């Protein structure tokens, strides 16, 4: 529980807790007409919101400013899908309200082939009851992944990811000494989270056949 490691963890939590879900989205989830079209508009707003907060959180990550400019974009794009589903898993696990959200998701023009593993995945996440701190570090670990396509200097990214692993690995030992494999179980969930890169490309195919409109931010972050 180093000084420098405690300084880092406060920096990450300062940035993670600025990220909030506007009331206007929440209110739409609860008040708006319930149709496939309207459920899909709501999901589009949520996703647009997720990406804005992702960008905010990312730009404040220690060392992020000092990375090559193109590499910065590569990590944002490269991470968006995994980061969104991880935020989405936290958020889901609001009072119910979550039920109503779940039904909007199940009725928004998405085949169960993609709906199924999403909810399955949320349950996997829920079974570890992770802390705020763990969600935040996992999130930064995903964003700062040196394996994404197009990165020119993977070593630079690797430097920034390592200290966050160390912190995370320590927290796991402190808040889960009874299970010494907790860390490994968390890295386990990143494996499951990577599979959504493929799922989301597929579902984005389905949706564009139907000719659904995306926002500029969604179009740009996902190369639509």
């Amino acid at each position: 529980l180093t000084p420098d490691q405690q300084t880092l963890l406060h920096f990450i939590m300062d940035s993670y807790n600025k990220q909030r879900m506007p009331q206007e989205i929440t209110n739409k989830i609860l008040k708006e007409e319930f149709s496939a079209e309207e459920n899909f508009l709501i999901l589009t707003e949520m996703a647009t919101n997720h990406v804005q907060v992702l960008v905010e959180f990312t730009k404040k990550l220690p060392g992020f400013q000092t990375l090559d400019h193109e590499d910065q974009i590569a990590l944002l794009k490269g991470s968006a899908v995994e980061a969104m589903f991880l935020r989405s898993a936290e958020i889901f696990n609001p009072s119910g309200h979550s039920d109503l959200l779940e039904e909007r998701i199940r009725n928004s023009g998405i085949s169960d082939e993609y709906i199924t593993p999403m909810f399955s995945f949320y349950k996997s996440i829920g079974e570890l009851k992770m802390t705020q701190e763990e969600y935040a570090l996992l999130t930064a670990i995903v964003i700062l992944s040196p394996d994404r396509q197009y990165i020119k200097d993977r070593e630079a990214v690797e430097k920034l990811q390592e200290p966050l692993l160390d912190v995370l690995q320590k927290l796991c030992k402190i808040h889960q000494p009874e299970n010494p494999q907790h860390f490994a179980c968390l890295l386990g969930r990143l494996t499951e989270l990577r599979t959504f890169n493929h799922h989301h490309a597929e579902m984005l195919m389905s949706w564009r056949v139907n000719d659904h409109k995306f926002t500029p931010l969604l179009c740009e972050i996902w190369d639509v």
């Binding site: 730009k59 910065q72 931010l217």
Partner: peptide, 11 residues
């Protein structure tokens, strides 16, 4: 580039 994203990173 990806200009909307660069704008958002530079605020």
């Amino acid at each position: 580039e990806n200009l909307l994203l660069r704008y958002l990173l530079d605020k």
